[PDB]
Curated annotation (Swiss-Prot), chain B:
Portion of the full-length sequence here: 716 to 764 of 1273
Glycosylation sites: N2
Organism expressing this protein natively: Severe acute respiratory syndrome coronavirus 2 (2019-nCoV)
Disulphide bond pairs: C23-C45, C28-C34
Summary of the function given for this chain in its UniProt record: Precursor of the fusion protein processed in the biosynthesis of the S protein and the formation of virus particle. Mediates fusion of the virion and cellular membranes by functioning as a class I viral fusion protein. Contains two viral fusion peptides that are unmasked after cleavage. The S2/S2' cleavage occurs during virus entry at the cell membrane by host TMPRSS2 or during endocytosis by host CSTL.
Protein name as catalogued: Spike protein S2
Encoding gene per record: S
Length: 50, 49
């Protein structure tokens, strides 16, 4: 007829805790912006997705 | 004028190992949305079983 399966009880979460804050203000509300032909590329890493 | 009692061997297969599979678990797993989507597709894996 069917198959016998079990059900989960609680959820377990484990994530890498890089809680060093992400300065998105200097990239979003920046005083100076680059042009289309020469766009500035910054490799943002090791921060939070706030 | 003479005879030889020779012995020959013949090998013939009979059957194999019986295999039974299920669609809702092997195709996707424990997802409820997959089962809901498969319920509207008919009874293909029922016919396979
Ligand atoms: C028919 O062939 C068999 C062998 O295939 C012969 O048996 C041999 O006989 C000699 C002498 O009697 C023995 O030294 C051998 O050891 C025997 N062979 C085996 C395998 O045992 C038999 O003699 C033959 N028959 C005739 C009438 O010649
Ligand atoms: C990450 O580190 C912080 C403090 O350093 C801690 O409170 C948190 O539990 C850690 N996250 C883990 C272990 O998953
Ligand atoms: C610029 O961005 C910052 C980011 O925190 C925000 O606080 C501020 O209101 C924005 N505008 C001005 C005019 O500074």
């Amino acid at each position: 007829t069917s198959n016998f399966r079990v059900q989960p009880t609680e959820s377990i979460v484990r994530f890498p805790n890089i809680t060093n804050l992400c300065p998105f203000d200097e990239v979003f509300n920046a005083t100076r912006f680059a042009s289309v032909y020469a766009w500035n590329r910054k490799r943002i890493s090791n921060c939070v997705a706030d | 004028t003479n005879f030889t009692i020779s012995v020959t061997t013949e090998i013939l297969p009979v059957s194999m190992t019986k295999t039974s599979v299920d669609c809702t678990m092997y195709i996707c797993g424990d997802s409820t949305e997959c089962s809901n989507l498969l319920l509207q597709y008919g009874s293909f894996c029922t016919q396979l079983k």
